[PDB]
Paper text:
Residing in the ER membrane, PGAP1 removes the inositol-linked acyl chain from nascent triacylated GPI-APs (dubbed GPI-AP3) to form the diacylated forms (GPI-AP2). In our quest to find stable proteins suitable for biochemical and structural studies, we identified PGAP1 from Chaetomium thermophilum (cPGAP1), which shares 20.7%/29.1% sequence identity and 33.8%/45.7% similarity with the human/yeast deacylase, respectively. Due to its higher model completeness (81% of its 1183 residues), the cPGAP1S327A structure is used here for structural description. cPGAP1 contains a transmembrane domain (TMD), a lipase domain with a typical α-β-α hydrolase architecture, and a third domain with two jelly-roll subdomains that show a classic β-sandwich fold.
Superposing cPGAP1H433N onto cPGAPapo positions the PLM carboxylic acid close to the catalytic Ser327, which forms the catalytic triad with the nearby His443 and Asp407. The three structures are overall similar, with a Cα RMSD (root-mean-square deviation) of 0.04 Å between the two product-bound structures and 0.38 Å between cPGAP1apo and the liganded structures.
Numbering used by the authors: 139 to 576, 604 to 873, 895 to 955, 980 to 1062, 1069 to 1094, 1102 to 1150
The structure:
Amino acid sequence: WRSPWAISVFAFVTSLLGIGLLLAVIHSSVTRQIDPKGCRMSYMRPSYAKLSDFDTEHTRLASKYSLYLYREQGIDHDVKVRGVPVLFIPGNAGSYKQVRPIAAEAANYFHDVLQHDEAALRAGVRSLDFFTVDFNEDITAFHGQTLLDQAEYLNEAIRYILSLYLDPRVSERDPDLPDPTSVIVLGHSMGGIVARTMLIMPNYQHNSINTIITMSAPHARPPVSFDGQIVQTYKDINNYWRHAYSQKWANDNPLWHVTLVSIAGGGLDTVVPSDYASIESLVPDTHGFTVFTSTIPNVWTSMDHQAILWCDQFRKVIIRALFDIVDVHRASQTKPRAQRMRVFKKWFLSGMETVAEKIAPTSDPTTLLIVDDKSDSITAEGERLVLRELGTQGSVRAHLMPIPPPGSPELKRFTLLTDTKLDKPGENGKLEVMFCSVLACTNVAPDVITLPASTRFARFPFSVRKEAEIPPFSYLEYVLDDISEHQFVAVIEKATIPTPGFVIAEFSDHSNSHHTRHIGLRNLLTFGISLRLPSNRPMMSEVRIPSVKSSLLAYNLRISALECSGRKDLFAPLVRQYLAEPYESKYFVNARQAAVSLHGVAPYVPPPMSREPEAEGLAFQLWTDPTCNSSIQVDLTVDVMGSLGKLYMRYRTVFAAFPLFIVSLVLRKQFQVYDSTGSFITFAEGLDLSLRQSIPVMLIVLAALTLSTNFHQNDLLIGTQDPFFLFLIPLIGIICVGVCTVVNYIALSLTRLISVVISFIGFLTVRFGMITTAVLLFLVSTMIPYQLAYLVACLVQLGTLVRAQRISSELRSPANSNFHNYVHSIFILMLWILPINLPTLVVWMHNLSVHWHHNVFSIMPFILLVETHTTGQMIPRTCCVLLRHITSILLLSLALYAAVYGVSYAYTLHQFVNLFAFWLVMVHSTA
Ligand SMILES: CCCCCCCC/C=C/CCCCCCCC(=O)O[C@H](COC(=O)CCCCCCCCCCCCCCC)COP(=O)(O)OC[C@H](N)C(=O)O
Ligand SMILES: CCCCCCCC/C=C\CCCCCCCC(=O)O[C@H](COC(=O)CCCCCCCCCCCCCCC)COP(=O)(O)OC[C@H](N)C(=O)O
Ligand SMILES: CC(C)CCC[C@@H](C)[C@H]1CC[C@H]2[C@@H]3CC=C4C[C@@H](OC(=O)CCC(=O)O)CC[C@]4(C)[C@H]3CC[C@]12C
Ligand SMILES: CC(C)CCC[C@@H](C)[C@H]1CC[C@H]2[C@@H]3CC=C4C[C@@H](OC(=O)CCC(=O)O)CC[C@]4(C)[C@H]3CC[C@]12C
Ligand SMILES: CC(C)CCC[C@@H](C)[C@H]1CC[C@H]2[C@@H]3CC=C4C[C@@H](OC(=O)CCC(=O)O)CC[C@]4(C)[C@H]3CC[C@]12C
C-alpha cells in the first residue's frame, strides 16, 4: 500500500525546483528589469450621447451593442456632427468610456488652438467626431464568434455614421465639403483585430476605412488559442493582408489606400506581449509601422495596457497626428496615403530612423542672407562650432560653417545639437540654422529631431509633473551626400543679450563616430563587452553589438563618469538604445546605469522579414560634450535574474497545454504498469517512475524536433528554432513536473476535505437525529454549451473520487486502491482541460444576461466515462499486446501533441482527450 500522499525524494526535489523556478520567473518579471512609469493622469469633462436611431432594423446585433458619440462638456452643446468621423473600438473587457482622454484632448485642441487658425481650416482641418461602441464588456479573445459579430456590427455603424453626415438635423457642416466616405478607426487591444476583421467581412463597404491606428493590439498572433474561431480569424485577416500587399499591381491590392499604425506600450504592458503587436509581417513599410511608445517624441515612456489611452503625454501626440492627416475637401476625410504616412512618421517616430525623409536640403530657399557678403563669420573647415551661451556680441550675428566637398570616400555627417529652439521660417527667435548656397538659405527647421533633454538634474526622459518638464533638445543630422549642393551651414544668433544656450555643430567622418562590436552571444554572456571611446570622439558616437537581437535576454549598461577638467559639461551624456526592425528606441538621460531590455526577435511571432544587411542587432547612440577632452567607457553585461522574467510574458500560455504532456506520460506509465503487473500505481508513484525514463526521453525528442515563405514556422513547441534556447524545453518541462505535482496534491486535499465534511455532517445528523446520474447526463446532453457539460462531469468525477477514497480507507483492499488511483488519474486529466474549456463558460453566462454534431460528439465520450465510473468498474486489464499498444500509443501521441501544438492550436486538445476518453469507454465495454 502506498498512500496517494507519499512522494519520492527524487520527485519532490524535481517538483520543488519547478515550483522554485516559476516563483523566480514570476518575481523577476514583476520586480527586475522594469521600465519607469511616466504616464500622467488625464482630467476631462465626460458626456456620451447614445445614437439610438441605429436599431434592430440596421443590425440584429443592435439589441446587443450600442453606439455612443462623445461630447466634451463645455465645448460640445449638441449631438450634431460638424467634423471628421472617428470610431474607437474598445478591447477585451473594455468600455466605450475608455475613449474619454483621446476624445477630450481632440475636443480641447480645436477649441483652444485650431478654430482660430484660418489656414488650417482652409486646407481642410475640421474637428474630429468621436463615436464609441459599447460591446457590453464582451470578452473577444476567448470567443471567436463574438469578434466576428462585433466586426459585422461596426461595418453597419460605419454605414450609419456616414449617413448622419448626409442629414441636415444631425449635421452642421459647410456645403462645398464632400460627403464623408470614410471613418478613421482607432482600436485598443482586441479592437485593432476587430478593425482589421471588418475589411475581410462580407458587409464591408469598399473604401470605408483608410486609416487604422491601433494601441496595444496583437496583430502577429492570438494572445490565447483557447477558441478555434480566433485562431482561424487571425489566419484569415493575416493572410488577407499578406496576399493583398503581395499583389504586383495596386489595382489588385484591396488594401492599397489603407494604413495600419500599430503602437505598443512596451514592457509595462502585462496583458498583451508587445512582441505580438508587430505588423512587419503583414504591412509593407509604405503602408504602416509598429512603434513602441518609448520612441514617440513628447512621450518617451512605456505604458501599461490602459495607460496608452489615459496618458496626457500620449493623448497630445495622437490628436496632433490625426489633425495633420485630416482633409474635409477629400471624400475620405484624410490626406493621401503617402502623405498620411509622413505625418505619422514625424509625430510617432524619432527622425533618426532610416525610413525618414529629410526634406529641407532640396526644399526651396526661404531666406535672403545679404549680411554674409562681408567675410566675418566664415569659419575654417574641420572647425567644430561650440556656442557655450548666446548673443554675447549684442547684435544679430552669424556663424557659418562650410559644407565639405563631395570628394569624400567615407560617409560623413553634419550633426548639430542645440538646447535652444530653432526658429521656423517667418518667426524670430534666438537661433536659426539654414543651409546657404552663395546667399540662398533654406531653414532646416522642418527637419529638427527633438531629443530628450539630458542635463545634470534629469533622471527620466519623461516628467509626470508638467511644471518640471525640461524643454527638449534640438538635433540635426544629415548625410553629406544629400547636403553637398549647399556650400555653408549658418547658425545665426539673433539673441542680443547674454543668454543660456549651447550650439555644438560638427562634420564627422563616419568611421571615427561609428563602432560595431562583433562578439558572440556566448562570449557576451560570459565576459560582457567593454568599449573605451577615445577622448577625440565625435559628439554623437554609435556602438552596435550585432549579436544581441533576442527579446529574452536583458543586460546592464554602465557608462563612465565623463568628469570634465576645467569647465563643466554643456550637457549630460544621453544614450539612445534602439532596434531597427520593430521601431523600439529607449532614451537614458544623464546616463550612468541603464537596464537594456529590448523587444527584438520574440518567441512565437512570424520570422522577422526585414533581413536588413548591416543594421541589425542592438545599437546604443551616445551624445556627450565633445569639448571635455576625456574618454568615456561603455560596459554591457548580462542580467541573469532579470532575463528570466523576460520568459514570464512570452510563455504565459504554455501552462495551458504543456502541463497536459506530463499528465499523459504519467498516465501512460500507470496504465502500462497496471497491464503488466495488475496494480494501478498512484500519480506520485507514476511521476517517480516516469521521471526516471519517459519524461526525460520525451523532453530529449521534443528538442530533436526543434533542431529538425512560410510565416507559421515559429508556431510550434518553444517557438524558436535557435539552438541557443533549447534549454527552454527543460525549464518548461521541470516547471510542469512541479505544477503537475502541486495540482495532484491540491486534488488529494480537496478530496480529503470533502470526505471529512461529509463525515462531520453524517456525525452531525447521526447522533442528533443512479437517478441523479441519469438526470445530469440528460441535462448535460440536452440544451447547454458543451463546456458546462464538461464542468458538471468534472464535479461528478470528484464525487466518484470522494466515494472511492472513503471505501478505500474503510476496506484498505488492493482493488479498492486500484479504483481510487484510476479515478484520481482520470479526474487529474480532466482538470487539465478546464484551462481551455472554462473561458467559454464566462462568455455564455454573461451574454445570457443580455438574452443572446460538435455540441454532442465533444462531451459524450467524457459523459459516458464519468458515468461508467459511477458504477464502480475498474478499466479491464489489457490481441493482448496489440490492445495495450493502442492504449500506450494513444497516450504518447497526446503528450507529443500537447507539447508541439498546444500553444497555437490548444483548442484541439479538448477533442484529443475526447478521443482518449472514448478509447477508455471501449476498453471498459470489452469486459
Ligand atoms: C488545474 C488546472 C487549472 C485550474 C482551473 C482553471 C483556473 C484558471 C484557468 C484559466 C482560464 C480562466 C482565467 C483566464 C484569465 C483571465 C485574464 C483576464 O481577464 O485578465 C486580464 C489581465 O489580467 C492578467 O494579466 C491576469 C494576471 C493574473 C492571472 C491569474 C490566473 C490564474 C492562474 C492560477 C491558477 C492556479 C490553479 C491551480 C489549482 C486551482 C484583464 O484584461 P483587461 O486589462 O481587463 O482588459 C483589456 C483592456 N482593458 C482592453 O480594453 O482591451
Ligand atoms: C518556462 C519559462 C516560462 C514559463 C514560466 C513562467 C510562465 C508563467 C506560467 C504560468 C502563469 C502563472 C499564473 C499567473 C502568474 C503571473 C501573475 C502576474 O505576474 O501577474 C501580475 C501580478 O503579480 C502579482 O501580484 C504576484 C502574484 C502572481 C502569482 C503568485 C503565485 C503563483 C502561484 C503558482 C503556484 C505555486 C504553488 C506552489 C506551492 C509551494 C500582474 O502584473 P503586474 O506586474 O502586477 O503589473 C504591475 C504593473 N503593470 C507594473 O508596471 O509593474
Ligand atoms: C496541497 C498544497 C499544499 C501543495 C503543496 C504540496 C507539497 C509541496 C507538500 C504538501 C503536502 C506534502 C506531503 C503530504 C504527505 C506526505 C506523506 C508523508 O508520509 C506518508 O503519509 C507516506 C508514507 C511514507 O512517507 O513512507 C510524508 C510527507 C509527505 C510526502 C508530504 C511532503 C511535502 C508535500 C508534498
Ligand atoms: C497554474 C497552473 C494550474 C496552470 C496555469 C494557468 C494558465 C492556463 C493561465 C495562467 C496565466 C494565464 C494568462 C494570464 C493573462 C492573460 C492575458 C489575457 O489575454 C487575452 O487574451 C486578453 C487580453 C487582450 O487581448 O485584450 C487573457 C489570457 C492570458 C494569456 C491568460 C491565459 C491563461 C493563463 C496562461
Ligand atoms: C467549488 C469547488 C471547490 C468544488 C467543491 C464543491 C463541489 C465539488 C461539491 C458540492 C456538492 C458535492 C457532492 C455532494 C454529495 C456527494 C455524494 C457523496 O457520496 C454519497 O452520496 C454518500 C456516500 C459516501 O460519501 O460514502 C460523494 C461526493 C458527492 C458527489 C459530492 C462531491 C463534491 C460536490 C459536487
